[PDB]
Every structure is written in structure tokens, then in C-alpha cells.
Amino acid sequence: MQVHVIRRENRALYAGLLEKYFRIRHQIYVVERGWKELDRPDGREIDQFDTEDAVYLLGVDNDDIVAGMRMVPTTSPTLLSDVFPQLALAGPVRRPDAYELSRIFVVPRKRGEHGGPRAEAVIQAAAMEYGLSIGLSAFTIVLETWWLPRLVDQGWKAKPLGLPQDINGFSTTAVIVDVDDDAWVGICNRRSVPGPTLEWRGLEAIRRHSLP
Ligand SMILES: CC(C)(COP(=O)(O)OP(=O)(O)OC[C@H]1O[C@@H](n2cnc3c(N)ncnc32)[C@H](O)[C@@H]1OP(=O)(O)O)[C@@H](O)C(=O)NCCC(=O)NCCS
Ligand SMILES: Nc1ncnc2c1ncn2[C@@H]1O[C@H](CSCC[C@H](NC(=O)/C=C/C2C=CC(O)C=C2)C(=O)O)[C@@H](O)[C@H]1O
């Protein structure tokens, strides 16, 4: 899988893939998960946090989107700040060095064991790769509570920001995850991800830091 960084500065280069992306999200979230609340008239699954400040990581395999991740700066409106503030006791995280992760998916074809590293593992490793590249110290996540043992198992250190709550019938919690060398090297080692997978097409102006 090839993981493309898509952001404000190179969005123009990815118009076609982004069109396909918002459609895939309809299938994954509205159709498969049955999250009818996210349905929209034109059939795209796009919400209030799909803005120019968002960063997408899109995994592409044999011309198809097979995995995805959305990242929103915590200085911008987030799911935590604007939709689920009650999940963080002290208040929303609003830090220049923290991003909120959302809309993680792998298409059915790439779930579980196939070729080498699991797509699930590659997209999450790519998230940490991005964070380390731009010098983030944390990722926030509003997530279903079944993620918690998975985050432990892949080597991440996720601290809860509050108590779990039932949202839309299911237990949900907000966490803050450390972004550091161990977080990335950890998943890579535990999941057989061969280090860097990110593409930075048209992003030559953006400085990043050497990966460990
Ligand atoms: C979450 C996801 C990336 C996991 O992919 P994967 O780990 O490669 O493969 P699977 O889907 O088989 O999931 C493996 C395990 O994760 C857990 N899991 C995955 N989806 C789950 C759900 N909706 N509810 C509860 N547990 C779930 C289960 O323990 C599952 O094993 P089991 O079904 O044998 O019990 C994938 O299922 C997906 O893309 N789902 C739709 C998007 C989504 O729900 N994302 C979170 C909200 S943004
Ligand atoms: N705009 C939105 N308004 C209102 N509601 C919304 C909006 N959007 C989504 N909901 C709803 O949020 C609920 C709880 S789930 C919390 C949000 C969820 N993200 C993760 O799980 C991240 C995992 C994750 C990410 C990275 C990882 O590495 C591991 C797990 C998501 O992006 O949909 C669901 O019932 C949705 O219907």
C-alpha cells in the first residue's frame, strides 16, 4: 500500500481521489456501519470537519483507495470540541502540537491478513509517521471503547480524557496518545511495517524532521 499525504497545499493534485474518498466513506460508515446519521443528500459522506485545515492519509493499492485516516488540528474545531465535549473532563484539547484522528477505515478486501503488514496497522503507523515528521507531541481520538486493547497491543500509550459514555448505543471515550519515536517504531516492529510509507507529492515546501 502507498499512503498519500493530502492537505491544503497539494489538494489540487488529488481532486479525483478525494471524490472517490468521500464516496468510499458513504459505503463504509453510512451503509456498512449503518451510521444513517452521517447520510447526506448527494451520497458523499462529508462532515463539518472536512475543511481546508484537515489532513488526509489515503492508502492506495492497485489504483484503489483501500485505507484512510483523517487528521484535524486541535486548534481547529474538532469532534471533541464541537460534538462530544463531555468526553473530556477538563475541557477540549486545543494545542498546536496535537491533532485529532478520525475516520479510520480499511475496505473489506484488505481487513485482516493478506500480503504483509495489515492495512489497519499501516494506516495507523502512517499517522504516527506524519506526527513525527511535523513534530506533533500528541494525537487525540474520540473512539469506540473496543479500540482500547488494540491501541495497547500495537504499542501506543493512550490516556483517557474522561469516563466512557454511551453514544449512539455504544460505549465511547476520548483519549490522548503520545507521539514519539517509540510509538512509531513500536507499531512498525509489532506489525511488520517496513518503516516510512508516506508520499509527500507536491509538498516540497513543507519541512519535516528525519524519522528514527
Ligand atoms: C476497524 C477496522 C479498520 C479494523 O480492520 P481489521 O482489524 O483489519 O479487521 P477486522 O474488521 O476483521 O477487525 C478485527 C477486530 O477488530 C474488532 N472490530 C472491528 N470492527 C469492530 C466493530 N464495528 N465493533 C466491535 N469490534 C470491532 C473486532 O474485535 C475484530 O475481530 P472479530 O470481528 O473477529 O471479533 C475495519 O473493520 C474498518 O475499516 N471498519 C469500518 C470503519 C470503522 O468502524 N472505523 C472506526 C470508526 S471511524
Ligand atoms: N461530524 C459528526 N457529527 C456527529 N457525530 C459524528 C460525526 N462524525 C462521526 N460521528 C459519530 O461519532 C460516533 C462515535 S465514534 C467517534 C468518531 C469516529 N472516529 C473514531 O472512532 C476514531 C477511531 C480511531 C482513529 C484512529 C486510530 O488509530 C484508532 C481509532 C468517526 O470519525 O466517525 C459514531 O456513532 C459516529 O456516527
Swiss-Prot record:
It catalyses: 4-coumaroyl-CoA + S-adenosyl-L-methionine = N-(4-coumaroyl)-L-homoserine lactone + S-methyl-5'-thioadenosine + CoA + H(+). Induction: Repressed by RpaR in the absence of 4-coumaroyl-homoserine lactone. Induced by 4-coumaroyl-homoserine lactone. GO terms for molecular function: transferase activity. Keywords: Autoinducer synthesis, Quorum sensing, S-adenosyl-L-methionine, Transferase. Pfam families: Autoind_synth. Catalyzes the synthesis of 4-coumaroyl-homoserine lactone, a quorum-sensing (QS) autoinducer molecule which binds to RpaR transcriptional regulator to regulate expression of QS-dependent genes. Belongs to the autoinducer synthase family. This is 4-coumaroyl-homoserine lactone synthase.
